[PDB]
A paper describes a structure:
Hexon is a trimeric, barrel-shaped protein that represents the main building block of the virus capsid. Adenoviruses are non-enveloped viruses with a capsid of icosahedral symmetry that encapsulates a double-stranded DNA genome. In this model, human lactoferrin (hLF), an innate immune protein, aids the viral uptake into epithelial cells by mediating interactions between the major capsid protein, hexon, and yet unknown host cellular receptor(s). Here, we present a new cryo-EM structure of HAdV-5C hexon at high resolution alongside a hybrid structure of HAdV-5C hexon complexed with human lactoferrin (hLF).
The structure of the HAdV-C5 hexon was reconstructed to FSC0.143 of 2.9 Å. To our knowledge, this is the highest resolution structure of HAdV-C5 hexon determined by cryo-EM. Due to the high stability of the trimer, the resolution is relatively uniform across the whole structure and thus it could be modeled unambiguously with a high average cross-correlation of 0.736. Throughout the length of the hexon, the protomers are in close contact forming large interfaces in addition to intertwined regions at the “turrets” and the base. Each protomer contributes approximately 16,000 Å2 to the interface with the two other protomers. Significantly lower resolution is observed only for the hypervariable loop regions, the “turrets” at the top of the molecule which are largely disordered and could not be built due to a lack of traceable density in the final reconstruction. Specifically, regions 137–164, 188–190, 252–256, 271–278, and 431–436 could not be sufficiently reconstructed. The same structure was used as a starting model to build hexon in the cryo-EM reconstruction but no major conformational changes were observed. The RMSD between both structures is 0.9 Å, indicating high overall similarity.
Numbering used by the authors:
A (entry chain B): 1401 to 1430, 1437 to 1551
B (entry chain C): 2101 to 2136, 2165 to 2187, 2191 to 2251, 2257 to 2270, 2279 to 2430, 2437 to 2801
C (entry chain A): 752 to 901
D (entry chain C): 2852 to 2946
E (entry chain A): 401 to 430, 437 to 551
F (entry chain A): 301 to 350
The structure:
Amino acid sequence: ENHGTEDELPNYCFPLGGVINTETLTKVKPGWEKDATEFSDKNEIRVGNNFAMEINLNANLWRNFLYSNIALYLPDKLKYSPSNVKISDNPNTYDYMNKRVVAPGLVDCYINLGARWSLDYMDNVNPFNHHRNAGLRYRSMLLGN
Amino acid sequence: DIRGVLDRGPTFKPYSGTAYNALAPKGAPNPCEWDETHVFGQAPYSGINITKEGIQIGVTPKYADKTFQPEPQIGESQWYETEINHAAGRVLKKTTPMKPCYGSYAKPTNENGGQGILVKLESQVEMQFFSTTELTPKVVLYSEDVDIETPDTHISYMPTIKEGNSRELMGQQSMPNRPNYIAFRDNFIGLMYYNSTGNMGVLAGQASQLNAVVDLQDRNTELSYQLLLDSIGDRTRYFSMWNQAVDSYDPDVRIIENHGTEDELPNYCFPLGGVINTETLTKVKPGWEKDATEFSDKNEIRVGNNFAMEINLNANLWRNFLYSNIALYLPDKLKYSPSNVKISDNPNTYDYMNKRVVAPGLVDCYINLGARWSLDYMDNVNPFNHHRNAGLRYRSMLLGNGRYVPFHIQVPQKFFAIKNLLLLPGSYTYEWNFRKDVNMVLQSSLGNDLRVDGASIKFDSICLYATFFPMAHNTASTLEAMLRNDTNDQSFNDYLSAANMLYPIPANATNVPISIPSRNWAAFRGWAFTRLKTKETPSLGSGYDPYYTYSGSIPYLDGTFYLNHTFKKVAITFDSSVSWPGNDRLLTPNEFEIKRSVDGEGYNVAQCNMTKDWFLVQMLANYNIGYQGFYIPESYKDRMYSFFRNFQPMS
Amino acid sequence: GYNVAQCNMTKDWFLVQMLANYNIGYQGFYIPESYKDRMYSFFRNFQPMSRQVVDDTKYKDYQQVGILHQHNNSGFVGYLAPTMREGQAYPANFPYPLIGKTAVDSITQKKFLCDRTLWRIPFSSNFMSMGALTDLGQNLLYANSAHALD
Amino acid sequence: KTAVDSITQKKFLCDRTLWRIPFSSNFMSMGALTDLGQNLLYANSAHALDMTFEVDPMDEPTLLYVLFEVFDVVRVHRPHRGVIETVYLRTPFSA
Amino acid sequence: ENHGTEDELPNYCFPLGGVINTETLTKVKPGWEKDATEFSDKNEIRVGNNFAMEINLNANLWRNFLYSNIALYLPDKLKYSPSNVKISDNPNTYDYMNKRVVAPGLVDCYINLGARWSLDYMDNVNPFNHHRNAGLRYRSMLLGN
Amino acid sequence: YMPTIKEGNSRELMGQQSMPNRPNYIAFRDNFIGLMYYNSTGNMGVLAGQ
């Protein structure tokens, strides 16, 4: 039910000390004259806003959910073998099904936006062979870890 | 109907995290000064010109009001820097406490929002000018002093002991105080005296003055009321008018289903302008030649990818959830006192229970990974004394969010002998007693002693309400006359209908024998037992307990038992010579074996250590299931307090 | 003295509503059966709430401040608009604390919400639902003559 | 591939409940007044009962809560106006 | 039911390579003497902790939820027109209701903290004219996107 | 946030910021309420023998 994400506000990261790029200024007094026997010549002053970077959160959470629960269960005909690594030739081996790489662009945060519509590839595969099967997960944890 | 005024004390804090400067980094300090004299600050505001009268904000020139300007929210608006030529800001004088920005609050002192301190009553802000190292000033700092407080946060790491604002004091960090809800107990348990001879409640005819209510020391009523309420209704709903909100807990915190996190993709954060480290290049044209009358010599071009850093989001969310809901509730023997800070010696004081520090490594995002397994330390502590108890949280929010709450509540009658009595015309004397100990009538989410934390309560007015059915007089006379026949006497029975015996168990003891002297056993119905902590149980029938210093949930009253999983064997015999039930009914023909170790795996069941015979007995006792194959009972037959509902196998 | 359910609803009105919907109240209030209180019933959508606010009359140091001057998370949140962050770090000046050692004197406000429902006033002697054709409807007083209602 | 040899641990949790041991021949709930309670063996004479529990220990004093559920019945009679009298009976363990 | 957020631990962000600002040092051996025919003079060593900043996550998620679901549905008397942009005069058009700006400070992560209390303004606005109305959302996706 | 009102690509125009438009679902009413005329004398529905 891809109804998008709520990302009206921007979220930021700020340095541990708050400011990291500050200049050193000297104190002067009234025509203006220098000062001594007071505040030292080494004063950490930051002009303007503090340095910070921004990351969208709801969009990132949506992307992680989609890739981990759908994009990894596409039919093998859509995936492709990786490069410079070994991979088992038998398609039923766990090694084969684990090392096949899927382009995230196939299913992203904008696929069929605003529509309640399962994928045209996902409907011909077993949905119960999924790691979110609560019954299967519960039975597995019953034996142990 | 009771009306009064309540004071919940300074311990009350009905929310996690803080309220002031929540988004701030936990180590970021407010701009301030100190002596060794050095100043550390930041001026965001931009003006036009700087003179001896301060920054000029507009027009003849106008200068900022030192009382409240420059405001600390106004700053720039474009991400790219523009080489501000005249800046202003605010700093704190050296005569103020040195605190981090996170959680720091200072009350205002004027309608414009200023926070300066007024003395004889005018403020005393000062002007400070700073210029580059080689003549006009460049920035102006508005130094002042405020009554800065930390209402809900405490220092988590104090670098040194020496008091006073010094350079080393910049490194302190703070984290919010633990949440602690305080409210009335479920169904107003404890406000009404029960099963106490000294505080006997009386209901008698006006003329006879002979008490019609006689209670017993061993009889339990509030627990009986709780069980009765569950059987005849549903407890998952909330009724505010009776303060009806059953205590519970999140199934996740009690039993962690740690199946890891989904973090296949990397999540990144990017600079505000997209690129920050870019070089300047000139434009050339075809052998190549320079160009003029065109694109300037200064062009911002960035080669390669843009600067960025990454976060594992799901892992971080998992860590925060675990530490805040589990690691803070470990037994105190695992924690350790912090350093360079004061802490109350009393283990029951909220200050002590708040300042003890827990290493996050004890419970991290990798503990028992892939297994549905509760911790070996969490299972011996009360799970209902947790800030996620929805019933407790709902009741706390009913009163309000302040510490001084005038309340007005309604209390029902719980004694089984009169709670359904149908009276007849006449005059009767109705008299009862009510408690005042805050440790009993109130309930906290941490169980800290409230007698020492200053919580108080005072009742002003008490009134009794009763509603009569507007029913016809003629048939009322017939009904009351017909009810005055000895053959039609009303009768009631207690729902629990049990005699309660408490037997001490010494610490670290394993075997506890009890004995009952010879007596008639006609009409006996059976046993029902559990285990309680003497720390969490008040004395029976005492008017006031001077040694009861626990304000958490009381399993003996509200029926929230959590120690049933600590039984191994039960042996029952009459006359000390004939065993019961005998007749080799069970696999062990002498005793009930609740659970065994791996040695007796041949008798385990349900993929646990609980033996088959005990499991069969419990199923038969609750739903009469087992003689024709086990299966899940009907949902309407296993209520909230039933056995099969709360049975959880783990490995 | 006449409120109920820890809100500002009067006792008599609350009793009438319970009687009108589920005939509950003459033998003690309790949770009605789930099948009896449907999605539009009164009790399903009854929500009593309360809160405390700073007593501007008793607090000696009260200073009413406007929206244009409250600074919380200053230097980390845009000013009066969902835009880029600006400003500088500074101790907050809003809202007034209501807990802890330095809590201020406060008053209380109580109110309630009730959606997807209609206030019902049955035309019966005891406000009970003993049939579609109520007893007062069959009373001869209104059966013969006419009356003007305001 | 590099997993290490391991042992297993099993346990269980049971909250908000009491261990129940009915005093009936087949542990069935066939009525409030159980058959064994009506047996003549316990109806005529008296018996001294002792019973031992074996529990795993912890490091703080604890209490063993035992409930001998019995019949607790009160009958209320009033002959005239404004006079109320009651009778109590808790059998066994009567005061 | 504003019961605050759980933010006891700080959540950080780290550079892609782990370290960015490292020095170049030479290897010496025992008095001490320089070395050759071994580790080159160009060695990337970082002293002290790695550079990183941090984010409060639960607080940010709470703010986004509040602004997107409440602050945008305040009565128009509390909002104010933006600047330097064109906005339709008719108060019923989508353009008008989309371009009015609301100061986030009206409803922030600290409004009525710890109290289960609806706002004094939302009690007079229709709660069913909300984008989280499941019935309305379901019927919309039924037609299509 | 528009920095300046003057049109044309200028340096000051770097600083504009965007936020998504408010969501607005449009669909038929529940149970197709309002599609058929009810309780209107002018648009009276009729069902009669032939």
